[PDB]
Design a protein around this ligand. Structure first.
Ligand SMILES: [Mg+2]
Length: 139
């Protein structure tokens, strides 16, 4: 029954290169931070992974407001593309089908609204970005 706000970010050095992701989960004054590293990845993959991991961190089904700088993510969800991809057999082939399948599952468990942020945008996405970069630096 909770509405949880999640701020997600991913970063990678190159295409492909070392990458990281971060998410900040917020419920009133409560906060939870998560992050991780991937040794060979793309910006798009880390953007999706941040959202996946953020949603996976929820302990119970929730209503979620998810803030991301990722147009890749947010457009797929808000322009109906993901739903059309599934309907058309993931095609030519959509990239990152493994991650989109996870996002399909998680957006059944949780009722998620996605919001695009512009970059910098607020301190919570900034923290998520810092956490993603932190993961790369630690590795
Ligand atoms: Mg992002």
């Amino acid at each position: 029954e909770k509405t949880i706000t999640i701020y997600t970010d991913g970063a990678a050095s190159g295409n492909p290169g070392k990458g990281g992701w971060g998410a900040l989960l917020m419920y009133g004054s409560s906060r939870k931070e998560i992050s991780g590293y991937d040794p060979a990845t793309t910006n798009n993959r880390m953007e999706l992974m941040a959202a996946i991991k953020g949603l996976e961190a929820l302990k119970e089904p929730a209503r979620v407001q998810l803030y991301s700088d990722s147009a890749y993510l947010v457009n797929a969800m808000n322009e109906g593309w993901l739903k059309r991809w599934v309907k058309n057999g993931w095609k030519k082939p959509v990239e990152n089908i493994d991650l989109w399948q996870e996002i399909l599952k998680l957006t059944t468990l949780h009722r998620v609204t996605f919001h695009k942020v512009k970059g910098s945008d607020n301190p919570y996405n900034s923290r998520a970005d810092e956490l993603a970069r932190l993961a790369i630096k630690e590795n």
